[PDB]
């Protein structure tokens, strides 16, 4: 399911990005 | 005749129908021209051109169908022209299948 | 393209049907899409029926029938030849054939 697997990959990048913004506040 | 026009750089299908028409004028039921070789390309393809019915099986092939292979040596390698004419009617034997029915 | 008007299911005037499982595969399959061939057979094979019938000391007891509704998932049905892939022309036929 490459579209469902792309969304999960997008989500595991956005959560990482949201964590990185939180380190600098 | 085909070997000459092919060495004269004529488009092959043009010449093949010219040979076919020279046997079509002569009253042959059909003529089959097969040109095989490196026709302009490294890969070899056999260009079969045919017009009218030709027969290929049994003893009436030895009698009614004439065949002619010429190894025309074109520049790229060597092509082979095979002209076959099928004359349904000759003075002696007749087709062993054709039933006239009056 | 849409292969079938039915959509492979018999759902009409409904949004959900009760799930059943393939007897062979165990895949959950909505009741409408299941193959559902009912079978009424005999407790023993015909080849053994004669010998069992002679063996019974009871006066008039027939080999009692076994009734089961086999419900199969689409894949289980095509693999086990319960249903066949038909041409677009014969796909419409609905009457049980053979």
């Amino acid at each position: 399911m490459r579209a469902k697997w792309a969304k999960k990959r997008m989500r595991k990048l956005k959560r990482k990005r949201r964590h990185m913004k939180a380190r600098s506040k | 005749n085909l070997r000459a026009k092919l060495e004269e750089a004529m488009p092959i299908r043009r010449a093949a129908y010219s040979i076919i028409r020279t046997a079509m004028r002569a009253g042959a039921a059909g003529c089959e021209v097969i040109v095989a070789g490196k026709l302009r390309a490294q890969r070899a393809r056999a260009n079969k051109f045919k017009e009218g019915c030709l027969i290929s099986t049994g003893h009436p092939k030895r009698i009614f169908l004439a065949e002619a292979t010429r190894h025309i040596k074109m520049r790229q390698g060597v092509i082979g022209v095979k002209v076959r004419i099928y004359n349904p009617n000759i003075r002696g034997a007749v087709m062993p299948d054709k039933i006239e029915i009056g | 393209p849409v292969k079938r008007r039915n959509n492979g299911r018999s759902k009409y005037n409904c949004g959900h049907t009760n799930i059943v499982r393939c007897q062979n595969c165990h895949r959950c399959v909505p009741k409408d899409k299941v193959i559902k061939r009912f079978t009424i057979r005999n407790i023993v094979d015909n080849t053994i029926a004669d010998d069992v019938l002679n063996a019974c000391v009871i006066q008039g007891f027939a080999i009692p029938k076994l009734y089961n509704k086999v419900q199969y998932c689409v894949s289980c049905s095509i693999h086990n030849h319960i249903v066949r892939v038909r041409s677009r022309e014969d796909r419409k036929i609905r009457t049980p054939p053979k």
Binding site: - | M95, D97, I99 | -
Partner: protein, 66 residues
Amino acid sequence: GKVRTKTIKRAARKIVENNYESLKPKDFQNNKAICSKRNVAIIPSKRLRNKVAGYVTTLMNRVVKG
């Protein structure tokens, strides 16, 4: 056993369309003699001519009942 081919079959009808009285219902030699009258029906080879006659005999047999 031996299954008649379209030449051995279409010609047989063409013979029963043109000729009716000359061939007879169970007469292979007569049906072979009518079919052998030179130009009226020309079949090269006895083997083809015999096979035609046998189918004509069968067709002639069929028409006489109905």
